[PDB]
Amino acid sequence: GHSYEKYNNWETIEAWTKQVTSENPDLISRTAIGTTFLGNNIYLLKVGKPGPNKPAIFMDCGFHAREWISHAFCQWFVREAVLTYGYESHMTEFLNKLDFYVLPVLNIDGYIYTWTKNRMWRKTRSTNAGTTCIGTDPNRNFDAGWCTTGASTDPCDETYCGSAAESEKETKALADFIRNNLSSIKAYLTIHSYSQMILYPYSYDYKLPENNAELNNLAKAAVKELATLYGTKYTYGPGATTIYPAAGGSDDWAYDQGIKYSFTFELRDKGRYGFILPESQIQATCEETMLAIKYVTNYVLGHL
Amino acid sequence: XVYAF
Ligand SMILES: [Zn+2]
């Protein structure tokens, strides 16, 4: 069965998306925003007390198949929303005043593959012309300085940028959804691991966003709140100079669409376990991450 | 999450 304290396979997560929606029809509705290369449904949970014309915060997890703590957190966040709504004042205010669009697993095909064949798989599982090599890095596949830096034109590389921007069904689906809801989505948050960082644009170039000062102070504040729980230390800054240049990322793309608050979260740890974070650390990781997420949410709320 | 950064 499903546990928030364990890593769940796709079959279990998919059944979970239906069950948690069904158990909390007052707080959650579910759709799909598209299907994957292998025909899996890219579920999207809309979390909030329904109301006319509400602003939204968008969060995805599971861009990269092997970063399991990512998938775990989206699941954790939704449980926390439904558990604490009406019992903890900030989350109650949050769900009352806005919606969270939570996309629990973007790269479903790849995720299944880490469970069935290769735990260190990163990319999608789409085929490529002219080679047997599989998959595109979905976070090199967005239309933002696409394939200009930090990416590879070689399909056999794990940072392969795809045959074109949005060449992947999953990234096209995500891009399509955000454009179709641009006027309500006020923040874009994409969850990765690992490195313990909060990054913002830009990654495709060394240039800085016009609200650079604003984004740096917010990530800084967020990193502080995150630490308050266990002292976990996060770094922060523009993607390009903070971790490395990487064109085609969803955070940069979303920002260039006009979404002023765009962050990539790299969760635990800093390399000791890396992608294979032990399940015993799921709870603490998600708890401290909740604080940074809730702080950004509060901030967005008072800056509409 | 690129190996090994
Ligand atoms: Zn990643």
Numbering used by the authors:
A (entry chain A): 6 to 188, 188A, 189 to 308
B (entry chain F): 2 to 6
Task: Show the paper's wording.
The general binding modes of 1–3 were found to be very similar and in the following discussion the complex with 2 is used as an example. Calculations with PISA33 revealed that the total surface area of 2 was 1036 Å3, while the area of the 2–CBP interface was 519 Å3. Thus, about 50% of the surface of 2 got buried upon binding, contributing to the high affinity. In line with the very high binding affinity of 2, there were no unsatisfied buried hydrogen bonds. All hydrogen bond donor and acceptor atoms of 2 interacted either with hydrogen bond donor/acceptors from the protein, or with bound water molecules. The amide moiety bridging R2-D-lysine and R3-valine interacted with the side chains of Arg71, Arg127 and Tyr248. Finally, a van der Waals contact was present between the R4-homotyrosine side chain of the anabaenopeptin and the side chain of Met125.
Carboxypeptidase B (CPB) was used instead of TAFIa for practical reasons, since TAFIa was found to be highly unstable with a half-life of approximately 2h at 22 °C30. CPB, on the other hand, is stable and highly homologous to TAFIa with 48% sequence identity.
